């Protein structure tokens, strides 16, 4: 169809990217990854990756999308048809990401529902699901006494199984919460995402205000000083392992949602001559600042918990994705009328995650319909396609909300869409653009659209800095490989690790496979075939 959509105003583009940027990756993923990696040792790789690859690649996606009015898949048909597999790899990343990203909001919805109560269940462990080993953290410091908050998170919400080999029963309450969130996502996407007028003044601003309140509460705690010292002081010895390097790298590639197709899709709606350099840098600063500021709140709470319980900071909570659900409720318990603040906090989590999810789903649909604009035209066809995609994603998320679903979630988070695949996709993007497509040609394209060249920082980052960082972490991770462990105590079965690698390979292998498919479908000799496919076709 001739029709192609565009933003009605630049504010819409800014809001869409801000909603895509700020979400569970900042307030939930960054705190637990830093806690797992030992605090300060996580930051040095983080800032290296950020100012080295993070922002330049984010500008790369937006400016590629703006240059070619196409989705994540069909954009590469004009830069490099031979390397069109990057778009397929990105969408597979998006498809896998949407399955497990929603489950966090399912946990938040369950927490939100179980906060409509006279007293918060995690304020004491006199409840049924609690073990006799429990002792109130107010008296834990006065042989393996445990906190009630951790007990609620594990026994009640997760109903944690002894291992992934024991899936157990399917949590009906989590399934209905999983369904409710997906129904919200469908009804907000089946027609089209919109700012909806003045409601943005509440949807967008509220999460930052709530985070500020949590930051004030955390820094005012008696043991905040020790937590901040652990957060900021680097452990140089930890840099001798690839874990801190890979975790910091893929976190940025995940938080910025750049290896995904959403950023290209959002850029595709921009005007050709639109100036977005300043906006991209400011939005990146907002995302990085939000994560760094939220880190202070989380670790201040953890420092207070360590001081109260008498245990070390590294041993005070879970070294896994459950850190947010163990730390933030605890801080809420230390506030007047804890029910009110818990309600606002989990509404804050839903608002941050739903806005990001809407961007991810909308980008996935936009990239997919670009392949078949006529068959997937607007109207009934799009509504059916969205309904089918949401239903399949719902059924795919159902396996990780069981008793042993936490291990499946951890496997998905580490390997699928948030691990080596981000390094794989990012390296090929910069390699094609800087070397095969031509850095000088792309700078000319950037100048034609923005009016100014990208500059030495962006050119060198695409040409050298990003490829070197991606390859180095790839080699370092593969040469010093260590297996994945849940909560640093559970060893995954060899088949579970193979499944995780297969999940990673499902996206990584898209690049070589499509290259073979593209090459084999082109007639003539090999040299002519590659020459044609390297030339912009569409």
């Amino acid at each position, epitope marked *: 169809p001739p029709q192609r959509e565009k933003w009605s105003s630049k504010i819409d583009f800014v809001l869409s990217v801000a909603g895509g940027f700020v979400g569970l990756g900042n307030v939930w993923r960054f705190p637990y990854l830093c806690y797992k990696n030992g605090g300060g040792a996580f930051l040095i790789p983080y800032f290296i990756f950020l100012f080295g690859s993070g922002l330049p690649v984010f500008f790369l996606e937006i400016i590629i999308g703006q240059y070619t009015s196409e989705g994540g898949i069909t954009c590469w048909e004009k830069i490099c048809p031979l390397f069109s597999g990057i778009g397929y790899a990105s969408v597979v990343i998006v498809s896998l990401l949407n399955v497990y990203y929603i489950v966090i909001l399912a946990w938040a919805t369950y927490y939100l529902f179980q906060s409509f109560q006279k007293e918060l269940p995690w304020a004491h462990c006199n409840h049924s699901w609690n073990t006799p080993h429990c002792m109130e953290d107010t008296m834990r410091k006065n042989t393996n006494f445990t906190s009630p908050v951790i007990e609620f998170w594990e026994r009640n919400v997760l109903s944690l199984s002894p291992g992934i080999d024991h899936p157990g029963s399917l949590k009906w309450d989590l399934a209905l919460c999983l369904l409710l969130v997906w129904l919200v996502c469908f009804f907000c996407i089946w027609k089209g995402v919109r700012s909806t007028g003045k409601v943005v003044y509440f949807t967008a601003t509220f999460p930052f205000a709530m985070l500020l309140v949590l930051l004030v509460r955390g820094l005012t705690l008696p043991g905040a000083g020790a937590g901040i010292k652990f957060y900021l002081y680097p452990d140089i010895t930890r840099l001798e392992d690839p874990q801190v390097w890979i975790d910091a790298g893929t976190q940025i590639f995940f938080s910025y949602a750049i290896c995904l197709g959403a950023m290209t899709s959002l850029g595709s709606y921009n005007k050709y001559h639109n*100036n977005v350099y300043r906006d991209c840098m400011l939005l990146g600063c907002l995302n990085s600042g939000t994560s760094f500021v939220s880190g202070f709140a989380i670790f201040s709470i953890l420092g207070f918990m360590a001081q109260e319980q008498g245990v070390d900071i590294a041993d005070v909570a879970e070294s896994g994705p459950g850190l947010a659900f163990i730390a933030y409720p605890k801080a809420v318990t230390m506030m007047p009328l804890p029910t009110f603040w818990s309600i606002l906090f989990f509404i804050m989590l839903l608002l941050l995650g739903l806005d990001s999810q809407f961007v991810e789903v909308e980008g996935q649909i936009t990239s997919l319909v670009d392949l078949y604009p006529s068959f997937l035209r607007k109207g009934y066809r799009r509504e059916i396609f969205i309904a089918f995609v949401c239903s399949i994603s719902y059924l795919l998320g159902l396996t990780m909300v069981t008793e042993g679903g936490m291990y499946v979630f951890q496997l998905f988070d580490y390997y699928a869409a948030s691990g080596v695949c981000l390094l794989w996709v990012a390296f090929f993007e910069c390699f094609v653009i800087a070397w095969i497509y031509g850095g000088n040609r792309f700078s*000319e394209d950037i*100048r034609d659209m923005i*009016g*100014f*060249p990208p500059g030495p920082w962006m050119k060198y980052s695409w040409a050298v800095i990003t490829p070197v960082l991606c390859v180095g972490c790839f080699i370092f991770s593969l040469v010093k490989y260590v297996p994945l462990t849940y909560n640093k105590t559970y060893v995954y079965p060899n088949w579970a690790i193979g499944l995780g690698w297969s999940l990673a390979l499902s996206s990584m292998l898209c690049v070589p496979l499509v290259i073979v498919i593209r090459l084999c479908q082109t007639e003539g000799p090999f040299l002519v075939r590659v020459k044609y496919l390297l030339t912009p076709r569409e």
Partner: antibody
Amino acid sequence: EVQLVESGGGLVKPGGSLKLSCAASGFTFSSYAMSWVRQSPEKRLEWVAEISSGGRYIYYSDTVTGRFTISRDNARNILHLEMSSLRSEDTAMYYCARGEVRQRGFDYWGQGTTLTVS
Amino acid sequence: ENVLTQSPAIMSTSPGEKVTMTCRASSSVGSSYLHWYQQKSGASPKLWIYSTSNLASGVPARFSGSGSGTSYSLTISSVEAEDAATYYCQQFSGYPLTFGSGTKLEM
């Protein structure tokens, strides 16, 4: 350091053709966008055409879109402007400008050469 | 075409007073896409102010610029000798590029 000097100009019959040139020195000519601006005897500046930093994107004024042509010589670092049909209103002095950054404008200008019609 | 117009055709003032000049645009232009050029009476033009506030390298800074939307202006704190020249405002936001009608200071 940066210097621009134009060459080529004289009397032509109406409807004739003449090719102008612009030499560059002191900078990487293959990295900066170039534009032609002409000043009529009435002293009014009129933009003519622009060639991108690599010569892939080209823009023309509405009045010279069908008769004028802008081109580059990156190896020789010389900018060429070719006219296929010089009308009576084409008499002016043509200036070579180094308009690379649109946010900064024509920061450098050449000496200029005059063109007249009989 | 976004035709640019300057209100004063010609100006003459004593070399001890401030003067002001305006540039009106037929369409709204970004603050970063309009520049002022100073042309000596007998030589080539020269970039004077760009981005509506950034003074060029060679300007004594005795100049200043302000504006937004479709109305723009340039100002001089106190004009001295050799300041008499023709000043052109230029649109650089969209093609075709347009220069103002030109305005000349005298005496």
